[PDB]
Amino acid sequence: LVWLEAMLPLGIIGGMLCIMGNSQYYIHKAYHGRPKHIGHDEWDVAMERRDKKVVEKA
Amino acid sequence: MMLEFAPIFIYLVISLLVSLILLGVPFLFSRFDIRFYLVSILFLIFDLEVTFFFPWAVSLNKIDLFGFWSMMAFLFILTIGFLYEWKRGALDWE
Amino acid sequence: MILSVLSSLALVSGLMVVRAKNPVHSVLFFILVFCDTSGLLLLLGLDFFAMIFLVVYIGAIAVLFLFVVMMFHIQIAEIHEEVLRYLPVSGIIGLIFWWEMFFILDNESIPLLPTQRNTTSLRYTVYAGKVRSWTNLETLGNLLYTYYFVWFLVSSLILLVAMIGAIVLTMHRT
Amino acid sequence: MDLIKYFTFSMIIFILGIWGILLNRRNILIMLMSIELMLLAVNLNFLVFSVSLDDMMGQVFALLVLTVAAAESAIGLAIFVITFRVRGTIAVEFINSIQG
Amino acid sequence: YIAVPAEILGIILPLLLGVAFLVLAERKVMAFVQRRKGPDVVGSFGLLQPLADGLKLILKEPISPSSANFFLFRMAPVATFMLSLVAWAVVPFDYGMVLSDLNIGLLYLFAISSLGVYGIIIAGRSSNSKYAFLGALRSAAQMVSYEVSIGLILITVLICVGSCNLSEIVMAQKQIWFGIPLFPVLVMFFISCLAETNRAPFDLPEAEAELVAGYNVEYSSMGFALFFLGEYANMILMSGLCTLFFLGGWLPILDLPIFKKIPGSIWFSIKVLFFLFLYIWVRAAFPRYRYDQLMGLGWKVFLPLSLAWVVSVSGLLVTFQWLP
Amino acid sequence: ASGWGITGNKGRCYDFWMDFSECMSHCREPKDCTLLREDYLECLHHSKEFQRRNRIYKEEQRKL
Amino acid sequence: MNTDITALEKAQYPVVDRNPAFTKVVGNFSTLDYLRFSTITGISVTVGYLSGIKPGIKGPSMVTGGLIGLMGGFMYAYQNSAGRLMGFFPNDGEVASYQKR
Amino acid sequence: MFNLFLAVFPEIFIINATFILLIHGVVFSTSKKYDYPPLASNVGWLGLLSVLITLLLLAAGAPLLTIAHLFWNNLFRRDNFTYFCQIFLLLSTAGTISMCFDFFDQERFDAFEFIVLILLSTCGMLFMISAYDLIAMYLAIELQSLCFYVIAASKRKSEFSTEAGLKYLILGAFSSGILLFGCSMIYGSTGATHFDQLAKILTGYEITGARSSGIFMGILFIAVGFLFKITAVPFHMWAPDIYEGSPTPVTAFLSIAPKISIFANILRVFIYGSYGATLQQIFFFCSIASMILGALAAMAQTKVKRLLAYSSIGHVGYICIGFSCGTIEGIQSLLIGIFIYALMTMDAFAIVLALRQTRVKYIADLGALAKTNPILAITFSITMFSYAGIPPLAGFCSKFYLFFAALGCGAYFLALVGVVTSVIGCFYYIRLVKRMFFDTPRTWILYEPMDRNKSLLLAMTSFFITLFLLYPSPLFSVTHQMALSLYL
Ligand SMILES: C[C@@H]1CC[C@@]2(OC1)O[C@H]1C[C@H]3[C@@H]4CC=C5C[C@@H](OCCC(CO[C@H]6O[C@H](CO)[C@@H](O[C@H]7O[C@H](CO)[C@@H](O)[C@H](O)[C@H]7O)[C@H](O)[C@H]6O)CO[C@H]6O[C@H](CO)[C@@H](O[C@H]7O[C@H](CO)[C@@H](O)[C@H](O)[C@H]7O)[C@H](O)[C@H]6O)CC[C@]5(C)[C@H]4CC[C@]3(C)[C@H]1[C@@H]2C
Ligand SMILES: C[C@@H]1CC[C@@]2(OC1)O[C@H]1C[C@H]3[C@@H]4CC=C5C[C@@H](OCCC(CO[C@H]6O[C@H](CO)[C@@H](O[C@H]7O[C@H](CO)[C@@H](O)[C@H](O)[C@H]7O)[C@H](O)[C@H]6O)CO[C@H]6O[C@H](CO)[C@@H](O[C@H]7O[C@H](CO)[C@@H](O)[C@H](O)[C@H]7O)[C@H](O)[C@H]6O)CC[C@]5(C)[C@H]4CC[C@]3(C)[C@H]1[C@@H]2C
Ligand SMILES: CCCCCCCCCCCCCCCCCC(=O)O[C@@H](COC(=O)CCCCCCCCCCCCCCC)COP(=O)(O)OCC[N+](C)(C)C
Ligand SMILES: CCCCCCCCCCCCCCCCCC(=O)O[C@@H](COC(=O)CCCCCCCCCCCCCCC)COP(=O)(O)OC[C@H](O)CO
Ligand SMILES: CCCCCCCCCCCCCCCCCCCC(=O)O[C@H](COC(=O)CCCCCCCCCCCCCC)COP(=O)(O)OCCN
Ligand SMILES: COC1=C(OC)C(=O)C(C/C=C(\C)CC/C=C(\C)CC/C=C(/C)CC/C=C(\C)CCC=C(C)C)=C(C)C1=O
């Protein structure tokens, strides 16, 4: 069971990777109000720009 | 859209700053070997091969059989060149 | 403004290509020029070409130049010369080229002077072309291998010539 | 003003290649480098025009020109290598024996 | 955009910590195979060892030998370190967990990989030492040689997916992980990753005892640390790429509610950890090739097999009309 | 003239090109196709459009 | 892939088959086509043999010359047969066989 | 689908045969069992065979080369003009190859890759002739150029050969960049690269006051590249150095085939396109400069190769006079001049290659040749008098047309220049005859007799040169046919 000593640094590396994912995910969500959408294309950008008008001018 | 490239630039700026901080804080307290040219040439050729592979790989669904065989002919020419290099000893470093 | 920054970087880096006393330094500045060019390509929306300029010009061609120039170990005495006496000949040739060739598009492509009015509202949006947008990569790949495949294959022949010539001119088998 | 700015960028690269030919009479490696600079400028000209004209022909030819530039540099550097090997030097006074 | 620097730091800082502890994990696993204890004095279970080593390095006087390439000598480690860092901007850790959702992300990764060679070349040339120069030339040649096979394997995955978007590459493996049908391609990719990161059995710069001086032999203090950190960050990145391309990234092993309970970032992390363990294990298990032998392997074995796999995958998918 | 657009649809100036080409394919004098030709070239470079808008900007700067 | 066989210069003989299939063209080979084929191949093998004697590889040289001659002769015979079926070459035999089957 | 490729049967065959020869050569040149035999002559004979089979395929399938023209339209354009140009190119390549075997075996130039590079350059020139778009034209030109760069440096331990290669690559790459810039300017100004589209856009306007400076400078840069390729003054100085420093078979090949290919390109670009009087003036001034400089520099030469190089520069000046005048007879005369100059150059280089077996270098080395080989001295004298344009030898056609156009376009300074340069040329051509027949040197050089290939080629070209004007009808008719086919 001594070999569990070697699993601690690997566990730390895994937690580090989980942080690099989740911290950037939550900061983006807090700033934009919704999570990042994978595959934002021309259509989605045009939708957001037109939706700014359709919301604010209502 | 090119919007997604802006975070990459800001990331580069921050990574550069981290590099300067780490490197700068301790300042406070005649034998030409042709085989390298030859390996450079081979890398150039296969670099262009990968370059031409990229659009083909994303376009296979639209170009169908004609595009497949045209790329096959391209590869046949380049692979004849590769066979020539292999036979001539360009791939041997001994 | 951003194009002013990138063009200034390219101008200085290119002058360094052509004026650095050490040829290894010239190769490194050349690499800076290709980086700036890639930036311009990103501004044009051509991300495939922007990446390919890094992969091929910097990743393969400049590496070849660097390997060759580094192993040459050129002494400055062999390639040194004073360039002060070229300022006039460069002045006339540069100016004539400057006066003719920086302004060649002006009569055909007259710039739109930016006015003190919001013209952005006159941008007309056609959503029909936005239902299924094509990347630069797939637009190019739709054409290279079918409608213009002969030119593709001739380029392959050019590369084969390069391989054969590289072997025949330099090979000394141990 | 976009198109004039993109064109003058490529134009300064081309003029720099010309100047590099003019200013490097004892340095033929830099002369080769200046020729690549001109080729890069032409490639940029094709890409800018493709966008401005909304036409793909400029892009196909740009890729093929990159292939030509690669082959050109490979063969040119091979010729440089063998010239150096024969003479032991790259100085221009040792490549002037053919004349008249 | 004001919050973008926070996201960037939330990527970069945990990555640097992860590298610091990857060094410790390598030491621990190597020791345990060798029936000894690795660092276990500096901190409990040796967990403070990386901080002590980093502190020692920053408190070490820099040397900067009297060369004529004063600027280049210090900038080479900066270049390699920055290149190791910037590849992570496009790496997705889970659905929507990615800094830059590049449509051309695969080619971008290839470009970064191709750029990696310049730090080593410039370090060798600028150091004013024939041994460093020769070692740097050999290492650079090895990296460019194995980059060809890496690119061709990338093309195989691209043919299967039909998009250069890394997240799309992950989500295309919902039906089956690409590592199952393309298992030999995955083995080839892992070996090519070993060779591309100058890792055992391909670690020429580590072969000082074999009369082969490394490219960083003249470096001290934080330039040497920058080279080391870039190398280990690249090891983590190669493990991540193996996970993304062949083990389905953040996807669970089986599409079942029991497996879907645990977050995708944890799946991704566990697969990355497996590949890092394999890195260490391989270094512990085998001797190293000579330069000529590994060059022969790069050009005579991995290139032909990669090209053959490209042809076979494309031909099969075209024939039965299974293309994306 | 090719018709292949940079975003995967018909090029912006291709219909003008085709009108000009179809005109020239049967008119024995090119002066009969001058209008269509200048329409094609105007689509490529927008020279007259931008010139007219610059006249408007000029008059605005003069009356201010 | 859109295709269009239409030639710039029209056929001057009756068009038996506008775009004949590969196997149809091969099956259309006449005695003269086979004579052309065999002559080209034989000359090529002979050149391979004679030019191979000095290097000492007359056998392999014969094989290489024969491969070149086989490919060239087959291409020439195919050219003639397809041109006859398409009406570009005098095709009395093709017309006679067409007016009967 | 397969039948569409009948339009490219000749090219497919030659490319495949070249690949076969590459594989054959590399497999057996490396053979320990066979003791690494030299394969330059074996591959040369097989490649001569391949060229002749390509010629058969092309000549016998004249209508078939136009099949599926709409499908191939955006790639190339085959017609009667390209038909005859390609046939002539293949014939020239076959002759040049046939002249190489004594060089292969006696020098022991064992590199079979030489033949492969020649064949690939022939493929490139074939595609050059049929090019109908700026992109295709550039690609084919580059393939041809890269093959020449490599073969110019084939004697890779020679100072001369390496110097030739280096000068060629640098100056060739520079000129190619200039031409590509011109192509980019034309595309940007017109949105087109296909020759038909360019013809439609540019016709009817030339310089109508509102001239596209982009179109005008694109044409100029393309013309500069073309003039470099045809070795027209002032873009000529690469040619004498490259011609002298390259291996003599390379020099013979470069002297003929690229001119045919590039003149096909020039005809189909400019003649078929439209900026107009400016470009004909370009070629007019370059023709005059080439005639004058070629005459004077050739008069200065003491070495045979350099003399022939400067002679070729002068003759391309004479030929470009025909392009300048812009008439059906001008094009016909240009073609007649190209054909006759090619045959004469083949004759001259067959003699030069025969004499290279005893290392001929200087004109004075020909002394007493009328004694040591009388029939060879007479044959070489006929070539010189033909070069001088003395009637009734075949060379008289170019002189006759030069003055015909001088009085047809209405140009008397051109006629004066032609008279003076013709007299200068006659002097330096008859100097060789004087050296072989009139001089009595103290030391003689005895030359080894030529091989059968060169003797037969010399015998046929010598009958043509002496007897062409007795039966010149087929050339006249075929060249008139080609000139007409450019527009109809
Ligand atoms: C050594 C040291 C030890 C200590 C330590 O360091 C190291 O150890 C380290 C270890 C770290 C933990 C590691 C992991 C997590 C999980 C994370 O939490 C899940 C992430 C969130 C989002 O991500 C999910 O969601 C994605 C999208 O679906 C999933 O994608 C799917 O779909 C893809 C496409 O099909 C497929 O491709 C994928 O395969 C498929 O899975 C993705 O996988 C999945 O992750 C969870 O979301 C939820 O939260 C939402 C909040 O809004 C709620 O929304 C709801 O409310 C809205 C408003 O009304 C409504 O509008 C909505 O409709 C309605 O749903 C709702 O509760 C629910 O959505 C919370 C953080 C934590 C605990 C970390 C903490 C810090 C540590 C303890 C570190 C610690 C420091
Ligand atoms: C892997 C290795 C590592 C190294 C590496 O790779 C290799 O790493 C790689 C990483 C690369 C960097 C990646 C990323 C960038 C950013 C880019 O920079 C974006 C600039 C573009 C985008 O800018 C805006 O774009 C939108 C506005 O356009 C903004 O949208 C708003 O406006 C919308 C409309 O109302 C609303 O709807 C939206 O809601 C609203 O938000 C958007 O927010 C904003 O981003 C272009 O913009 C400009 O262009 C304009 C046009 O010319 C100029 O207009 C001007 O001229 C006009 C007349 O012409 C006059 O009329 C005008 O009045 C007058 O102003 C003006 O200068 C300026 O706007 C510059 C290049 C660079 C640095 C790359 C360099 C090279 C690398 C380092 C590579 C490197 C090599
Ligand atoms: C009128 C034209 C305009 C002016 C130009 C004139 C150009 C010539 C200059 C004239 C001045 C005098 C020229 C003297 C040349 C005459 C001598 C001569 O050439 O004799 C040759 C003869 O050269 C020839 O071989 C000429 C052959 C040409 C064939 C042309 C005839 C075609 C049909 C004839 C059919 C065959 C013969 C029929 C009868 C048997 C002998 O060559 P040798 O080198 O001495 O020895 C040759 C070796 N051996 C004798 C052993 C074989
Ligand atoms: C390392 C791998 C080497 C592979 C070498 C072997 C293959 C080399 C390529 C040989 C040419 C094709 C041989 C394969 C025969 C099968 C062809 C076939 O199946 O016919 C298809 C058609 O295939 C072709 O016609 C493509 C031919 C490829 C071009 C090869 C070049 C031949 C000569 C070109 C002349 C140009 C000059 C050459 C320049 C150097 C039918 O398609 P379709 O008409 O139904 O629809 C078209 C398509 O599906 C939609 O886009
Ligand atoms: C038009 C004006 C009037 C012209 C009159 C034309 C009349 C027709 C010609 C009649 C020919 C009379 C001689 C016929 C018998 C000779 C048969 C040659 C026998 C032979 O096999 O020669 C072989 C060599 O190939 C060779 O020597 C043959 C190749 C020589 C080059 C021939 C042309 C090939 C390429 C085409 C070029 C076209 C150029 C056009 C621009 C081997 O000979 P060997 O046994 O003695 O040993 C040589 C040592 N290796
Ligand atoms: C004997 O005295 C001397 C000269 O005097 C002949 C000289 O020159 C020079 C040195 C200066 C030179 C050579 C500059 C001349 C260079 C030029 C004009 C560059 C162009 C190159 C060539 C070969 C000229 C070809 C161009 C021509 C004929 C005209 C251009 C084209 C058209 C009209 C279409 C020296 C030392 C000299 O001591």
Residue numbers in the entry:
A (entry chain a): 3 to 60
B (entry chain A): 1 to 29, 55 to 119
C (entry chain J): 1 to 174
D (entry chain K): 1 to 100
E (entry chain H): 2 to 325
F (entry chain e): 2 to 65
G (entry chain f): 1 to 101
H (entry chain N): 12 to 499
Task: Quote the study that presented this structure, word for word.
Protein complexes of the mitochondrial respiratory chain assemble into respiratory supercomplexes. Here we present the high-resolution electron cryo-microscopy structure of the Arabidopsis respiratory supercomplex consisting of complex I and a complex III dimer, with a total of 68 protein subunits and numerous bound cofactors. A complex I-ferredoxin, subunit B14.7 and P9, a newly defined subunit of plant complex I, mediate supercomplex formation. We propose that the main role of the plant supercomplex is to stabilize its components in the membrane.
In the heterotrimeric γCA domain of Arabidopsis, only the catalytic site at the γCA1–γCA2 interface binds a metal ion. In the high-resolution structure of the Arabidopsis I + III2 supercomplex, we now find a coenzyme A at the potential catalytic site of the γCA2–γCAL2 interface. Our present 2 Å map indicates that the cofactor is a butyryl- or crotonyl-CoA; the only difference between them is one single or double bond, which is not discernible. We therefore refer to this factor as γCA-CoA-X. The 3′-phosphate ADP and the diphosphate group of CoA-X interact with hydrophilic sidechains of γCA2, γCAL2 and C1-FDX either directly or via hydrogen bonds. The crotonyl or butyryl group of CoA-X is located at the catalytic site of the γCA2–γCAL2 interface, interacting via a central water molecule with two histidines and additional hydrophilic sidechains. In the Arabidopsis I + III2 supercomplex, B14.7 is present. Together with subunit C1-FDX and a set of lipids (five phosphatidylethanolamine (PE), three phosphatidylglycerol (PG) and one Q), B14.7 binds tightly to the C-terminal loop of ND5 at the centre of the membrane arm close to the complex III2 interface. Our structure indicates a second lumenal half-channel at ND2 with a possible proton translocation pathway along a chain of water molecules and hydrophilic residues. At the ND6 π-bulge, the hydrogen bond chain of the hydrophilic axis is interrupted. P9 is a small, 62-residue subunit that spans the inner mitochondrial membrane once near the ubiquinone binding site.
